[PDB]
Amino acid sequence: TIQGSIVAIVTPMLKDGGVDWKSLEKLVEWHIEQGTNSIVAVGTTGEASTLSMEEHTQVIKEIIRVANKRIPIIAGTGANSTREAIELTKAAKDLGADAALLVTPYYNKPTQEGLYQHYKAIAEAVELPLILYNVPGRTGVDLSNDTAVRLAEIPNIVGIKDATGDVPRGKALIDALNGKMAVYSGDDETAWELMLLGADGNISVTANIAPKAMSEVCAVAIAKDEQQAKTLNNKIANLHNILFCESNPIPVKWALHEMGLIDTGIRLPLTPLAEQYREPLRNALKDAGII
C-alpha cells in the first residue's frame, strides 16, 4: 500500500559531523511540499552505519514529529545480528514508525535459510510492517527471488527493496509474487522501468535533490505510461548516473550542499565528495534545472 517516490533521506550534518537538526527539519518539510510520498529515515543514504543507536532514535523521532502524519515514515532498522535487528525494529515501532526497512545481514554472509530465519524471527517478534532490502554489492549476500517469495507468506512482511538493478530478475520477482508483497526499486536508473512492470515505488537517492521530478516519474510509471515515463526520466537520468560517481551518499550530500540545503558534514569512513567531481556535478545540477 505505500507507493510512489520514497526518498532515502540523508541525515544532514554540521561541519563537525554533528546531526544538523534544523536542516533535517527543513528538508522533510520541503519533501512533503514537493510531492515526495514518504521518507526512509536512517537508511544507507542516511548513514545508518555512522550514527549511534541514540542518534538513530533521535533522527527517526524528529522526522516523524515534523511529518506530522502527512506522509508515512519508514525507519531503516537493519542489522547483521538478528537479535539487534529485533531491538532496532521494536524501537522504531514504539516510536510510531509506519514501517521498517531491513537490509539483509551484511558481512557475515548467512545462508538463504538463515536469511529466512532472520526475517521470520523479526516479523514474529515485532508487530510492524517489514520491508526486505537486497543490495548484494554492499552486503556480500544475495537474497534470492525464491527466498523473498517464501517470506512474502508472512503477513507483516509487506515488501522488498530490490537494488539489484537487474530488470529481468525484478520482473521475474514481481510475477512470482502476486500482490503477496510489494516490490520497490532501489536502483534509480532503472526504477522507472521497474514501476512500468509493476513495482509499487522507488526508494530513491535521486529524490533527495529532485523530489518533484521523481514524484512525477513514479506516478506516471506506476500508471504504466511508458512514453511519458521515459521522457520525464530522461530529464533526470544524468543525475541517476552522477549521484554514484563515488559511493552513495557522498555525491548526493555534496549535491544538497551545492543546492544550499545542507552543510558539508559527513562521517568517516565516508568523505566529502572528491574535488574531481564537484564541478561536473554542479553542471549536472544546472543541466537539470535544479540550480
Ligand X SMILES: N[C@@H](CCCC[NH3+])C(=O)O
Binding status of residue 268 toward a copy of itself by CB under 8 A: yes
Binding status of residue 50 toward a copy of itself by CB under 8 A: yes
The dihedral through the CA atoms of 83, 96, 24, 238 has a sign that is positive
Binding status of residue 142 toward ligand X by CB under 6 A: no
| 1 annotated as belonging to a binding site for a ligand | no
Give 173's contacts (C-beta < 8 A, 6+ positions apart): 145, 148, 149, 160, 162, 183
277 has catalytic annotation = no
With contacts defined by CB under 8 A, name the span among 31-39, 123-131, 136-144, 217-225 that binds a copy of itself: 136-144
User: Which residues in 224-263 contact a copy of itself (CB under 8 A)?
Assistant: 246-247, 250
d(CA 158, CA 130): 6
Q: Are 142 and 160 in contact (CB under 8 A)?
A: no
d(CA 130, CA 119): 9
Among 36, 37, 44, 208, binds a copy of itself (CB under 8 A): 44
Long-range contacts of 220-228 (CB under 8 A, 24+ apart): 221/191, 221/192, 221/193, 221/195, 221/196, 222/3, 222/4, 222/195, 224/196, 226/196
Minimum distance of a copy of itself from residue 20's CB (angstroms): 17
Q: Each residue of 124-135: b (16+ CB within 10 Å) or e?
A: eebebbbbbbbb
Residue 241: which of a copy of itself, ligand X, none does it interact with, CB under 5 to 8 A by kind?
A: none
CB count, 10 Å around CB of 142?
16
Among 68, 231, 247, 276, binds ligand X (CB under 6 A): 247
User: Which residues in 28-67 contact ligand X (CB under 6 A)?
Assistant: 44
161 has catalytic annotation = yes
Binding status of residue 246 toward ligand X by CB under 6 A: yes
Of the candidates 118, 205, 113, the one whose C-alpha atom is nearest the C-alpha of residue 157 is 118
Minimum distance of ligand X from residue 241's CB (angstroms): 10
H runs (alpha helix) in the chain: 21-34, 53-67, 82-94, 112-125, 136-139, 145-151, 167-176, 188-196, 211-222, 226-234, 237-242, 250-258, 275-287
With contacts defined by CB under 8 A, name the span among 34-42, 88-96, 134-142, 176-184 that binds a copy of itself: 134-142
User: Which residue among 93, 116, 119, 161 is the active-site one?
Assistant: 161
Among 1, 111, 231, 234, binds a copy of itself (CB under 8 A): 111
Among 11, 23, 139, 147, binds a copy of itself (CB under 8 A): 139
Identity at 159, one-letter amino acid code = G
| 45 annotated as belonging to a binding site for a ligand | yes
Binding status of residue 269 toward ligand X by CB under 6 A: no
Instruction: Give helix 112-125 / helix 82-94 axis angle, nearest 10°.
Output: 30
| 44 annotated as belonging to a binding site for a ligand | yes
Binding status of residue 140 toward a copy of itself by CB under 8 A: yes
Q: Which residues bind a copy of itself (CB under 8 A)?
A: 44, 47, 49-50, 80-84, 103, 105-111, 113-115, 117-118, 121, 137-140, 246-247, 250, 267-271, 274
List binding-site positions for pyruvate. 44-45, 133, 138, 161, 203, 248
Q: Which residues bind ligand X (CB under 6 A)?
A: 44, 109, 135, 137-138, 163, 244, 246-248
Catalytic residues: 133, 161
